[PDB]
Amino acid sequence: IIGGEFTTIENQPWFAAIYRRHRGGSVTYVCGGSLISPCWVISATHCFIDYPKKEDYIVYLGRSRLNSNTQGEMKFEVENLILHKDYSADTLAHHNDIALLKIRSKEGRCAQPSRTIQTIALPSMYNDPQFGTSCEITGFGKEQSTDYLYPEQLKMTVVKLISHRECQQPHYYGSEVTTKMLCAADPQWKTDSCQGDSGGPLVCSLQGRMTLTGIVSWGRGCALKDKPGVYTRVSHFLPWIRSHTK
Ligand SMILES: NCc1ccc(Br)cc1
Protein backbone atom coordinates (compact mmCIF):
# COMPACT_ATOMS: atom_id res chain seq x y z
CA ILE A 1 0.00 0.00 0.00
CA ILE A 2 1.38 3.40 -1.04
CA GLY A 3 0.72 6.05 1.60
CA GLY A 4 -2.12 5.30 4.01
CA GLU A 5 -1.32 4.04 7.47
CA PHE A 6 -0.13 1.07 9.44
CA THR A 7 -2.99 -0.85 11.00
CA THR A 8 -3.57 -4.16 12.74
CA ILE A 9 -5.62 -7.23 11.82
CA GLU A 10 -8.46 -6.10 14.18
CA ASN A 11 -9.27 -3.27 11.79
CA GLN A 12 -9.46 -5.68 8.83
CA PRO A 13 -10.21 -9.09 10.37
CA TRP A 14 -11.26 -10.68 7.07
CA PHE A 15 -7.74 -10.15 5.64
CA ALA A 16 -5.94 -13.38 4.69
CA ALA A 17 -2.14 -13.53 4.22
CA ILE A 18 -1.18 -16.09 1.50
CA TYR A 19 2.35 -17.57 1.33
CA ARG A 20 4.09 -20.19 -0.85
CA ARG A 21 6.32 -23.04 0.30
CA HIS A 22 9.63 -23.23 -1.48
CA ARG A 23 12.06 -26.01 -2.28
CA GLY A 24 15.05 -25.26 -0.14
CA GLY A 25 12.44 -24.77 2.57
CA SER A 26 11.95 -21.01 2.25
CA VAL A 27 8.44 -19.62 2.59
CA THR A 28 7.59 -16.31 0.99
CA TYR A 29 4.57 -14.07 0.74
CA VAL A 30 2.37 -14.30 -2.34
CA CYS A 31 -0.79 -12.19 -2.07
CA GLY A 32 -3.68 -11.06 0.07
CA GLY A 33 -7.15 -12.53 0.26
CA SER A 34 -10.48 -12.16 2.09
CA LEU A 35 -12.42 -14.57 4.29
CA ILE A 36 -15.95 -14.76 2.85
CA SER A 37 -17.08 -17.77 4.87
CA PRO A 38 -15.51 -19.99 7.54
CA CYS A 39 -13.95 -22.36 4.95
CA TRP A 40 -13.42 -19.99 1.99
CA VAL A 41 -10.89 -17.29 1.14
CA ILE A 42 -11.34 -15.23 -2.03
CA SER A 43 -8.28 -13.81 -3.89
CA ALA A 44 -6.96 -13.11 -7.46
CA THR A 45 -6.15 -15.87 -9.98
CA HIS A 46 -3.02 -14.10 -11.11
CA CYS A 47 -1.38 -14.71 -7.79
CA PHE A 48 -1.45 -18.43 -8.46
CA ILE A 49 -1.46 -19.01 -12.20
CA ASP A 50 2.31 -19.62 -12.42
CA TYR A 51 2.34 -22.25 -9.64
CA PRO A 52 -1.06 -23.85 -9.48
CA LYS A 53 -0.64 -26.66 -6.94
CA LYS A 54 -2.58 -26.12 -3.78
CA GLU A 55 -0.11 -28.10 -1.74
CA ASP A 56 2.35 -25.27 -2.10
CA TYR A 57 0.28 -22.62 -0.28
CA ILE A 58 -0.38 -21.61 3.30
CA VAL A 59 -3.11 -19.20 4.44
CA TYR A 60 -2.89 -17.22 7.67
CA LEU A 61 -5.83 -15.45 9.24
CA GLY A 62 -5.53 -13.14 12.27
CA ARG A 63 -2.10 -12.00 11.14
CA SER A 64 -0.91 -8.39 11.60
CA ARG A 65 2.75 -8.96 10.58
CA LEU A 66 4.40 -10.37 7.49
CA ASN A 67 7.31 -12.48 8.74
CA SER A 68 6.65 -12.80 12.47
CA ASN A 69 3.80 -14.15 14.59
CA THR A 70 0.65 -12.33 15.84
CA GLN A 71 -1.22 -13.52 18.91
CA GLY A 72 -4.44 -15.22 17.81
CA GLU A 73 -3.26 -16.00 14.25
CA MET A 74 -4.42 -19.26 12.62
CA LYS A 75 -2.57 -21.26 9.99
CA PHE A 76 -4.46 -23.18 7.26
CA GLU A 77 -3.67 -25.43 4.32
CA VAL A 78 -5.35 -25.19 0.93
CA GLU A 79 -7.84 -28.04 0.43
CA ASN A 80 -9.10 -26.63 -2.88
CA LEU A 81 -7.44 -24.02 -5.16
CA ILE A 82 -10.02 -22.82 -7.69
CA LEU A 83 -8.72 -20.51 -10.44
CA HIS A 84 -11.05 -18.96 -13.04
CA LYS A 85 -11.14 -20.94 -16.37
CA ASP A 86 -11.42 -17.72 -18.40
CA TYR A 87 -8.46 -15.93 -16.83
CA SER A 88 -6.30 -14.02 -19.24
CA ALA A 89 -3.89 -11.19 -19.06
CA ASP A 90 -3.29 -8.26 -21.39
CA THR A 91 -0.03 -6.42 -21.34
CA LEU A 92 -1.67 -4.51 -18.48
CA ALA A 93 -5.07 -5.82 -17.63
CA HIS A 94 -6.02 -9.14 -16.12
CA HIS A 95 -9.44 -10.56 -16.85
CA ASN A 96 -11.64 -12.69 -14.60
CA ASP A 97 -8.87 -12.21 -12.03
CA ILE A 98 -10.61 -14.03 -9.21
CA ALA A 99 -9.78 -17.15 -7.20
CA LEU A 100 -11.08 -19.28 -4.33
CA LEU A 101 -9.11 -21.14 -1.68
CA LYS A 102 -10.91 -23.66 0.48
CA ILE A 103 -9.13 -23.68 3.81
CA ARG A 104 -8.72 -26.22 6.56
CA SER A 105 -6.42 -26.69 9.48
CA LYS A 106 -4.22 -29.72 9.88
CA GLU A 107 -6.71 -30.48 12.60
CA GLY A 108 -9.46 -30.13 9.98
CA ARG A 109 -11.21 -27.02 11.29
CA CYS A 110 -12.34 -24.04 9.24
CA ALA A 111 -12.08 -20.44 10.59
CA GLN A 112 -13.62 -19.53 13.97
CA PRO A 113 -14.41 -15.81 14.56
CA SER A 114 -12.53 -13.85 17.22
CA ARG A 115 -11.21 -10.38 18.05
CA THR A 116 -8.80 -10.83 15.06
CA ILE A 117 -10.78 -13.08 12.60
CA GLN A 118 -14.17 -12.31 10.99
CA THR A 119 -15.87 -13.07 7.67
CA ILE A 120 -16.72 -10.24 5.28
CA ALA A 121 -20.05 -9.89 3.44
CA LEU A 122 -20.40 -10.37 -0.30
CA PRO A 123 -22.37 -7.70 -2.12
CA SER A 124 -25.82 -8.54 -3.52
CA MET A 125 -25.99 -9.48 -7.21
CA TYR A 126 -24.85 -6.52 -9.38
CA ASN A 127 -25.10 -4.16 -6.33
CA ASP A 128 -22.11 -1.75 -6.06
CA PRO A 129 -21.78 1.69 -4.41
CA GLN A 130 -21.86 4.95 -6.44
CA PHE A 131 -18.76 6.69 -7.87
CA GLY A 132 -17.10 9.09 -5.41
CA THR A 133 -17.81 6.64 -2.55
CA SER A 134 -14.86 6.11 -0.17
CA CYS A 135 -13.60 2.54 0.24
CA GLU A 136 -10.65 0.92 1.98
CA ILE A 137 -7.87 -1.33 0.73
CA THR A 138 -5.50 -3.38 2.88
CA GLY A 139 -2.30 -5.31 2.33
CA PHE A 140 1.35 -6.21 2.89
CA GLY A 141 2.33 -4.87 -0.55
CA LYS A 142 5.10 -2.41 -1.31
CA GLU A 143 5.12 1.02 0.31
CA GLN A 144 6.88 2.49 -2.80
CA SER A 145 6.87 1.02 -6.37
CA THR A 146 10.71 1.10 -6.28
CA ASP A 147 11.11 -0.85 -2.98
CA TYR A 148 12.53 -4.35 -2.86
CA LEU A 149 11.14 -5.22 0.60
CA TYR A 150 7.55 -5.52 1.76
CA PRO A 151 6.56 -3.73 4.93
CA GLU A 152 6.49 -5.92 8.02
CA GLN A 153 3.25 -4.42 9.42
CA LEU A 154 -0.15 -4.52 7.74
CA LYS A 155 -1.28 -1.31 6.06
CA MET A 156 -4.56 0.18 4.85
CA THR A 157 -5.68 3.29 3.07
CA VAL A 158 -8.74 4.97 1.61
CA VAL A 159 -9.57 5.37 -2.08
CA LYS A 160 -12.61 6.61 -4.05
CA LEU A 161 -14.58 4.55 -6.62
CA ILE A 162 -14.25 6.14 -10.08
CA SER A 163 -16.93 5.89 -12.81
CA HIS A 164 -16.48 3.48 -15.70
CA ARG A 165 -16.96 6.49 -17.99
CA GLU A 166 -13.99 8.21 -16.32
CA CYS A 167 -11.83 5.05 -16.18
CA GLN A 168 -12.49 4.68 -19.93
CA GLN A 169 -10.71 7.91 -20.85
CA PRO A 170 -7.67 7.35 -23.04
CA HIS A 171 -5.38 9.10 -20.62
CA TYR A 172 -6.45 6.34 -18.21
CA TYR A 173 -6.82 2.73 -19.34
CA GLY A 174 -9.22 2.91 -22.29
CA SER A 175 -10.37 -0.44 -23.74
CA GLU A 176 -8.39 -2.45 -21.15
CA VAL A 177 -10.92 -1.73 -18.34
CA THR A 178 -14.21 -3.68 -18.63
CA THR A 179 -17.54 -4.05 -16.75
CA LYS A 180 -16.10 -7.01 -14.78
CA MET A 181 -13.77 -4.44 -13.14
CA LEU A 182 -13.96 -1.35 -10.90
CA CYS A 183 -11.52 1.56 -10.78
CA ALA A 184 -10.53 3.39 -7.58
CA ALA A 185 -7.91 5.97 -6.77
CA ASP A 186 -7.02 8.90 -4.64
CA PRO A 187 -8.41 12.23 -5.72
CA GLN A 188 -4.89 13.58 -5.60
CA TRP A 189 -3.18 10.33 -6.63
CA LYS A 190 -1.08 10.12 -3.47
CA THR A 191 -2.18 6.69 -2.20
CA ASP A 192 -2.82 3.33 -3.88
CA SER A 193 -2.38 -0.44 -3.80
CA CYS A 194 0.95 -1.75 -5.14
CA GLN A 195 2.81 -5.00 -5.92
CA GLY A 196 2.05 -7.62 -3.25
CA ASP A 197 -1.40 -6.15 -2.45
CA SER A 198 -3.01 -8.29 -5.20
CA GLY A 199 -5.85 -10.53 -4.09
CA GLY A 200 -6.70 -8.31 -1.16
CA PRO A 201 -9.97 -6.58 -0.34
CA LEU A 202 -11.52 -3.35 -1.54
CA VAL A 203 -14.08 -2.76 1.24
CA CYS A 204 -17.05 -0.36 0.99
CA SER A 205 -19.98 0.40 3.29
CA LEU A 206 -23.09 -1.10 1.67
CA GLN A 207 -26.49 -1.17 3.46
CA GLY A 208 -24.70 -0.19 6.71
CA ARG A 209 -22.34 -3.15 6.38
CA MET A 210 -18.67 -3.56 5.39
CA THR A 211 -18.91 -5.37 2.00
CA LEU A 212 -16.29 -6.97 -0.30
CA THR A 213 -16.83 -4.82 -3.38
CA GLY A 214 -13.49 -5.38 -5.12
CA ILE A 215 -10.36 -7.55 -5.25
CA VAL A 216 -6.98 -5.88 -5.87
CA SER A 217 -6.08 -6.88 -9.51
CA TRP A 218 -3.75 -4.49 -11.42
CA GLY A 219 -2.63 -0.98 -12.21
CA ARG A 220 -0.05 0.88 -14.24
CA GLY A 221 2.37 1.55 -11.44
CA CYS A 222 1.44 2.58 -7.95
CA ALA A 223 -0.01 6.01 -7.14
CA LEU A 224 0.79 7.47 -10.56
CA LYS A 225 -1.30 10.23 -12.04
CA ASP A 226 -4.30 9.18 -14.12
CA LYS A 227 -3.58 5.55 -13.47
CA PRO A 228 -5.96 4.34 -10.80
CA GLY A 229 -6.03 0.93 -9.14
CA VAL A 230 -8.11 -1.66 -10.96
CA TYR A 231 -10.11 -4.21 -9.08
CA THR A 232 -12.15 -7.32 -9.84
CA ARG A 233 -15.83 -6.34 -9.55
CA VAL A 234 -17.13 -8.86 -7.02
CA SER A 235 -20.87 -8.16 -7.56
CA HIS A 236 -20.62 -9.53 -11.14
CA PHE A 237 -19.18 -12.94 -10.00
CA LEU A 238 -21.79 -14.25 -7.52
CA PRO A 239 -22.84 -17.21 -9.74
CA TRP A 240 -19.17 -18.23 -10.11
CA ILE A 241 -18.71 -17.87 -6.33
CA ARG A 242 -21.91 -19.69 -5.21
CA SER A 243 -21.34 -22.51 -7.73
CA HIS A 244 -17.70 -23.12 -6.83
CA THR A 245 -18.37 -22.80 -3.05
CA LYS A 246 -20.20 -26.19 -2.84
N1 LIG B 1 -0.22 -6.10 -9.83
C1 LIG B 1 0.49 -5.26 -8.89
C2 LIG B 1 -0.23 -3.94 -8.75
C3 LIG B 1 -1.57 -3.92 -8.36
C4 LIG B 1 -2.24 -2.70 -8.23
C5 LIG B 1 -1.55 -1.52 -8.49
BR1 LIG B 1 -2.42 0.15 -8.32
C6 LIG B 1 -0.21 -1.55 -8.88
C7 LIG B 1 0.45 -2.76 -9.01
Swiss-Prot record:
Phosphoserine PTM positions: S145
Disulphide connectivity of cysteines: C31-C47, C39-C110, C135-C204, C167-C183, C194-C222
Domain Peptidase S1 span(s) in chain numbering: 1-246
Organism superkingdom: Eukaryota
Catalytic machinery residues: H46 (charge relay system), D97 (charge relay system), S198 (charge relay system)
Glycosylation sites: Q144
Protein name: Urokinase-type plasminogen activator chain B
